[PDB]
């Protein structure tokens, strides 16, 4: 709790780096208390937005999710993405999106996590409840990975939620007017079209 | 009939969410 509040309150970022190292010690050589899990998760979601600390932060989150608290942590990060008290906390929502996606379908996927993407994508949709360019950029990057890699694995329900997410992204582009987000959303559509051409797309082509 | 299929898609959606919930609740 004290190290997490340090990471939230510190002005210095080297303090955050050694904080991630100490939390890695707690996660690896000890047990993260299950009651410290939400504050740990919030701290990592905040830290994963610092450019110099993403690699340590992702390694720490991956080590935590390699413990027994992994499914609990994925559920907590989906809870953060869905809770209304965190709609405006864009860095935290972006971090939760990054973490859940990277753990379940990233190149650094944890194959110990038994969760199908279907279980967490509704939380991705709710993370976009308040429009935010960076949160939606992380959403679309993570979903780009999920689609370009697991297109065959993605069944119809996962594609339902993915198309709902792409619909909310296309809504936001009527108001955010951000060219980087617009570019990757329309590239994502173009990849979904290519999957339709290769017949590896299992979603509702009507939608 | 397609409404039945859609209902089963949503039943899957909540079942997958509940399986994540239960794994997070059970690995404690």
């Amino acid at each position: 709790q004290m190290i997490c509040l340090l990471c939230v309150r510190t002005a210095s970022s080297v303090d955050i780096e050694v904080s991630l190292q100490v939390l890695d010690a707690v996660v690896c050589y000890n047990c993260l208390p299950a009651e410290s899990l939400p504050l740990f998760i919030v701290t990592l979601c905040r830290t994963i937005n610092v450019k110099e600390l993403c690699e340590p932060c992702w390694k720490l989150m991956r080590n935590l999710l390699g413990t027994h608290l992994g499914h609990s942590a994925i559920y907590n990060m989906c809870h953060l993405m869905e809770d209304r008290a965190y709609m405006e906390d864009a860095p935290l929502l972006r971090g939760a999106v990054f973490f859940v996606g990277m753990a379940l379908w990233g190149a650094h996927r944890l194959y110990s996590l038994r969760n199908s993407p279907t279980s967490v994508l509704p939380s991705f949709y709710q993370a976009m409840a308040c429009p935010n360019e960076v949160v939606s950029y992380e959403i679309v990057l993570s979903i780009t990975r999920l689609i370009k890699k697991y297109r065959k694995e993605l069944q119809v329900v996962a594609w339902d939620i993915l198309l709902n997410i792409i619909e909310r992204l296309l809504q936001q582009l009527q108001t955010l007017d951000s060219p980087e987000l617009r570019t990757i959303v329309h590239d994502l559509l173009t990849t979904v079209e290519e999957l339709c051409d290769q017949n590896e797309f299992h979603g509702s082509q009507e939608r | 009939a397609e409404s039945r299929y859609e209902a089963q898609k949503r039943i899957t959606q909540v079942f997958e969410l509940e399986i994540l919930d239960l794994y997070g609740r059970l690995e404690k």
């Binding site: 709902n164 | 209902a7 949503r10 079942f15």
Partner: protein
């Protein structure tokens, strides 16, 4: 005059055809009340629960029952509902699951949309005997409010302010002197569609019209509410007192309220005319 016999026989003729004309059924539902024995059938047909073709009703009701039992069993499996859970809340959870808007646990407090659906579901329980039919009628009705009338319902308060003056201007002047016009219970009247305001034995006469494309019937129902209670409303003298009275109106005069609201809606929006 045996006009009830004429209405019932005309509806039975409309229901005799192997293909039910939903447009004729809507026009009839506008112009007349539905007999209680055919109300659930006609509401199912106009809400799209049953398709126009009468032959398809057996298989489509099998589909509706299968969907209902599947969603209900799923809610039982994730322990969202139980046998103790009230039927209206069961319908609310089924609707949330089918719309993908189910919370993480039932202990999550209801959203305003959830309370609106719950109120309409409670009112539907008293109107429709069968649980599957009641659920489908409820879901399609609330979906009409969110789809067929997403733009029409917000205009309804202004239409109330208009027709209220057009039938007794001094009454709306009495309300505006209290500056209580924006504090009237429009969420009850027009989001919950008078669910919980009128007894269901006469709220069903309103909802015949709401199913058949008319949400202005709600405006005229509210107008006739305040016209019926002119003696009380003109004695009301505070915005909060008016708001609380309008949410708990005496239920004895409600049959006449809805009858004269239908009369008023036939007078101001005209009598429906069968197409040539």
């Amino acid at each position: 005059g045996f006009r009830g016999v004429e209405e019932k026989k005309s509806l039975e003729i409309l229901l005799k055809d192997d293909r039910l004309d939903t447009e004729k059924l809507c026009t009839f539902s506008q112009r007349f009340p539905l007999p209680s024995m055919y109300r659930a059938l006609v509401w199912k047909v106009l809400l799209g629960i049953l398709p126009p073709h009468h032959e398809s009703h057996a298989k489509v009701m099998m589909y509706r029952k299968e969907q209902y039992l599947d969603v209900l069993h799923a809610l039982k499996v994730v322990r969202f509902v139980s046998d103790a859970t009230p039927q209206a809340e069961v319908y609310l959870r089924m609707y949330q699951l089918e719309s993908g808007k189910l919370p993480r646990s039932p202990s999550f407090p209801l959203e305003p949309d959830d309370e609106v659906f719950l109120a309409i579901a409670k009112a539907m329980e008293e109107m429709v005997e069968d649980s599957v039919d009641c659920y489908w009628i409820t879901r399609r009705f609330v979906n009409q409010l969110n789809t067929k009338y997403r733009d029409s319902l917000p205009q309804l308060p202004k239409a109330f302010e208009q027709y209220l003056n057009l039938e007794d201007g001094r009454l709306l002047t009495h309300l505006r002197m209290c500056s209580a016009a924006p504090k009237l219970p429009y969420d009850l009247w027009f989001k919950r569609c008078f669910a919980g305001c009128l007894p269901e034995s006469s709220l069903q006469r309103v909802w015949d019209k709401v199913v058949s494309g008319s949400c202005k019937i709600l405006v005229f129902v509210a107008v006739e509410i305040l016209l019926t209670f002119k003696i009380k409303v003109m004695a009301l003298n505070s915005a909060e007192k008016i708001t609380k009275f309008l949410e708990n109106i005496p239920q004895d005069s409600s049959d006449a309220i809805v009858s004269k609201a239908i009369d008023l809606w036939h007078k101001h929006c005209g009598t429906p005319v069968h197409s040539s």
